[PDB]
Design an enzyme around this catalytic site. Sequence first.
Site, PDB file in Angstrom:
ATOM      1  N   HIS A 174     131.025  52.923 -35.212  1.00  0.00           N
ATOM      2  CA  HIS A 174     130.141  53.758 -34.415  1.00  0.00           C
ATOM      3  C   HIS A 174     129.621  53.159 -33.125  1.00  0.00           C
ATOM      4  CE1 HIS A 174     130.077  56.663 -37.641  1.00  0.00           C
ATOM      5  NE2 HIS A 174     129.616  55.767 -38.491  1.00  0.00           N
ATOM      6  N   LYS A 185     140.389  60.191 -40.109  1.00  0.00           N
ATOM      7  CA  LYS A 185     138.983  60.499 -40.404  1.00  0.00           C
ATOM      8  C   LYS A 185     138.585  61.841 -39.775  1.00  0.00           C
ATOM      9  CE  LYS A 185     134.247  58.697 -40.294  1.00  0.00           C
ATOM     10  NZ  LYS A 185     133.355  57.516 -40.109  1.00  0.00           N
ATOM     11  N   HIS A 213     124.526  53.137 -41.348  1.00  0.00           N
ATOM     12  CA  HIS A 213     125.145  54.430 -41.438  1.00  0.00           C
ATOM     13  C   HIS A 213     124.689  55.354 -40.335  1.00  0.00           C
ATOM     14  CE1 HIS A 213     126.166  53.540 -45.861  1.00  0.00           C
ATOM     15  NE2 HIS A 213     127.309  53.563 -45.197  1.00  0.00           N
TER      16      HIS A 213
END
Length: 116
Positions: A11, A38, A109
């Site tokens: 990310h 993904k 996350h």
Amino acid sequence: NSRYTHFLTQHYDAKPQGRDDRYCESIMRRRGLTSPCKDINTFIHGNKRSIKAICNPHRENLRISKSSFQVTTCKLTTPSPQNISNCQYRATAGFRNVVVACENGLPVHLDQSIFR
């Protein structure tokens, strides 16, 4: 922490070129987010210190950043017949507050749902 460095791999991209479909094709490939493809993935841009600053032990607290970040979201799209096997992405770039899970002061996350 391995959760945090995994977060960076999936990310974080400090200085993106283009932030278009072509950018998504390239970066999803090189971060290992293809084969298998993904479904959705957002990259946060800018400096690493500012992301860490959004946030024991394996407990996570959900936090939305108080300021916005440049982001590029790569979303899996309709494959072309010429390479149906390959991962085709559509890019959506913007300036968004991000939602992360924080563990021990580090983001581990990203809440992908809000970019869907």
